[PDB]
Symmetry: C2
Subunit: 101 residues, 2 copies
């Protein structure tokens, strides 16, 4: 997975766009770029690799306790993980209607 920099060089970032000159399988080089905006995100100040849609990659979603979303979610290696998240962290009651904050 990854490791572009081992066989590429003259790399540059301009905003979210990475450009690099990379060795071809059968010889010679090619310059290309990739826009990282759809795959990297800012999570509370940290750059992180964007995850997947949970309805697509998790099964058996259900409420655990009174406030927790639980599911079995796939790793990038297709192993299932038992996982919980507390909806009380960012889900509020505003005047009777559920809202995110």
């Amino acid at each position: 997975l990854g490791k572009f920099s081992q066989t590429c060089y003259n790399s540059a970032i301009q905003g979210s766009v990475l450009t690099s000159t990379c060795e071809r399988t059968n010889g010679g080089y090619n310059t290309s770029s990739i826009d990282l905006n759809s795959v990297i995100e800012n999570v509370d100040g940290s750059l992180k690799w964007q995850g997947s849609n949970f309805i697509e990659t998790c099964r058996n979603t259900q409420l655990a306790g009174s406030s927790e979303l639980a599911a079995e979610c796939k790793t990038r290696a297709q192993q299932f993980v038992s996982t919980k998240i507390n909806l009380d962290d960012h889900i509020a009651n505003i005047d009777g209607t559920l809202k995110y904050e």
Copy 2:
């Protein structure tokens, strides 16, 4: 932030949709549902709160060395902090072109 469960009852998860009977600012009960699909994501098997669009909430992006993207990104409390991520984690050279895997 949050704490919907202190003032809501009969809470239900249907797929990505959360439903609850909630208390209203000035009495009575409200029933709302909210879709968690846009605010929670599956990160490597873990349910996590989804972050922000990076080019919209970060600045001063640069490549630090051969493969580290460095930036200043805004935290939830609106402060800029320094952060980096290793592009070699998921950016590959596929026959001379840059690809995410």
